[PDB]
Amino acid sequence: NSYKMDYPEMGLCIIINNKNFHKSTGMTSRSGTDVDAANLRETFRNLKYEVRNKNDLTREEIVELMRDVSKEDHSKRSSFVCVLLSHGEAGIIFGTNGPVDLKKITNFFRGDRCRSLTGKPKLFIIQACRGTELDCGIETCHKIPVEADFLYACSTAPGYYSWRNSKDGSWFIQSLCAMLKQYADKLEFMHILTRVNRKVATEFESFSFDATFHAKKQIPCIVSMLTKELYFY
């Protein structure tokens, strides 16, 4: 009923942290993202993941990184974690010089394409916009599918902007790290992520001099194709 998490290694945690984008793209610098990346590094280090931080990657460097990691031998590793911190749109995360399709990235890890991860949880944690909607809130052959064992922990609902504080980091990553620190020794991962949903939904609200962007809310979106319960302990 739960994934085997007592392989010799918990696995890799790849963190792609895009802060500065090529001028020609017109994309703004993502102030606060270094806070997220540092928090994520410490959070996952404590969970015994082998963390690799990558900063300011082009669209082709992202693809090449993911391809290479998917070709590593993960036989001794329990799981795989990839964190993407960038601008985005529906289905898309941005490299510093242009977009990468998320499906292209995740496909490298399919059950038939990365055999040393077949049957093990593959977790993709994404802090990026998924569109431009704002939430105004309301007061008060084979044997297993190749798409199985993926979880996407998305920072925001489909179609919506995702919020990041330039001083504190992104709402979602702040909350995800806090909940993992507090509950990773107590709760199954889906229940941890539900607590993240509640923390983001209840404790954060945007403040802006621009009325269009002021007093806005956010709900993260858990997408699970997992087949077992996931415990980090």
Partner: peptide, 4 residues
């Protein structure tokens, strides 16, 4: 607060 900023959007991504």
């Amino acid at each position: 607060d900023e959007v991504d």
